Amino acid sequence: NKEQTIFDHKGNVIKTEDREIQIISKFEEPLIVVLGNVLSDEECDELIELSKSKLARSKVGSSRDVNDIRTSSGAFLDDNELTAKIEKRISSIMNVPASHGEGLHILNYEVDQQYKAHYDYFAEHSRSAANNRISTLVMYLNDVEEGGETFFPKLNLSVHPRKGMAVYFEYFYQDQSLNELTLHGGAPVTKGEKWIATQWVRRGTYK
Amino acid sequence: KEQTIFDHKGNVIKTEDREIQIISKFEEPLIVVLGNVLSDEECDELIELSKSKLARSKVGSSRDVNDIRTSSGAFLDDNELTAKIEKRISSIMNVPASHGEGLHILNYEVDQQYKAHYDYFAEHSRSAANNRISTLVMYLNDVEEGGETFFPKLNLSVHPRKGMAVYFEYFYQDQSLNELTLHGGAPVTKGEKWIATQWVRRGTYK
Numbered sequence A: 001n002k003e004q005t006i007f008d009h010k011g012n013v014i015k016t017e018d019r020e021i022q023i024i025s026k027f028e029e030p031l032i033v034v035l036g037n038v039l040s041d042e043e044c045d046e047l048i049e050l051s052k053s054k055l056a057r058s059k060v061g062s063s064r065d066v067n068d069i070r071t072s073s074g075a076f077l078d079d080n081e082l083t084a085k086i087e088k089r090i091s092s093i094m095n096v097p098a099s100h101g102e103g104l105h106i107l108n109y110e111v112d113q114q115y116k117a118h119y120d121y122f123a124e125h126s127r128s129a130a131n132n133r134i135s136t137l138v139m140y141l142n143d144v145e146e147g148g149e150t151f152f153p154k155l156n157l158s159v160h161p162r163k164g165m166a167v168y169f170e171y172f173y174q175d176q177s178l179n180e181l182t183l184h185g186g187a188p189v190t191k192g193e194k195w196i197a198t199q200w201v202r203r204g205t206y207k
Numbered sequence B: 001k002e003q004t005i006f007d008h009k010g011n012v013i014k015t016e017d018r019e020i021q022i023i024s025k026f027e028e029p030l031i032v033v034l035g036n037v038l039s040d041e042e043c044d045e046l047i048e049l050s051k052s053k054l055a056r057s058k059v060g061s062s063r064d065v066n067d068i069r070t071s072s073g074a075f076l077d078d079n080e081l082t083a084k085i086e087k088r089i090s091s092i093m094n095v096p097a098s099h100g101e102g103l104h105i106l107n108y109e110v111d112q113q114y115k116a117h118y119d120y121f122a123e124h125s126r127s128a129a130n131n132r133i134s135t136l137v138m139y140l141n142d143v144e145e146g147g148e149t150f151f152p153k154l155n156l157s158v159h160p161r162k163g164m165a166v167y168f169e170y171f172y173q174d175q176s177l178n179e180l181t182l183h184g185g186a187p188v189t190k191g192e193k194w195i196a197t198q199w200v201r202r203g204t205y206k
């Protein structure tokens, strides 16, 4: 008897209020789902541009408080109608209220940059682990000429960037060994560049 | 790790007439989800060809699909379209089109399925002298619900999406790797499922 998952959409599409998302493939335990048609091309481009501080003194996401998680690398977007619209769609996908999301986090990889394998949930006895992360949505905002795979090294599987698509995965299982298998990284970009939006989702209301 | 037939290491496969998208990979045994394999028009035309073929061959017999029997009536007749598609496929699969059996068409209506099976033949069968080594399953339409291609020993499934495909191979020296490619077509629960399949042999098959 498999454990319950947060994501429980049973078909080949997720009908959200403003967009029909395609369920492409999935690995079952832990649950890793490739999703098509998550963002339009225009939404992808706008999220990239919104992430830019453009050498000004104020960092994008400056409207976030000392209770907010702060990202050294990349930027959390400031809330607006677009991010709210997208967070609502993502909430239908991830089956959790948008109030549990940390907000759209944008990251750029230049050529040869990578993200070493890591967990998205916080350390077990950490303080952040009181309202720990339970699931991730990584959205590909552009096409990557070569490289840039999201790889899960303990599962020997990867998802390749494709503009408008996403990879979803969760790690709220009671057998910790399942959460351990969501170890993942971003492979080096070897030609071109890579842009992603990540939604990290908390067990409890976050914002 | 054993070398795979499928050689493509980037995010796209550039064929003569089409740029295929590599969407995701399970490494061992190798299972690859491919985008943009067939245009919408190619999918639509393959289905119309199948309807003619299934009708003219008076095919469509059993309740569910079944790997015991032959299925000659469900291979499309060779024409310009099919040759063009097999040429593309051969660049994807990295095996000459002369090793392919040809575009085999299957249709599933509600509650029909294809129970888990290996595509390759058992050792010492007569077909094992020139055994199948890899499969490409192309989704020719969208399926309201159900109809996933599933691999039960790997807990992995590919959902039908018009124009996409799932590639997998089973030519490993480690027989346990080949046995992990056990796979089936899950019941359609809403709508209907059309696929084309290319099975590729170790040696020439033309």
Ligand SMILES: O=C(O)CCC(=O)C(=O)O
Pocket (backbone or CB within 6 Å): B114, B119, B135, B137, B147, B148, B149, B150, B183, B184, B185, B186, B195, B197
């Ligand atoms: O219908 C499916 O998804 C699987 C098809 C299949 O098993 C085959 O053609 O070899």
Ligand SMILES: [Co+2]
Pocket (backbone or CB within 6 Å): A118, A119, A120, A184
């Ligand atoms: Co991560």
Ligand SMILES: [Co+2]
Pocket (backbone or CB within 6 Å): B117, B118, B119, B135, B183
């Ligand atoms: Co099969």
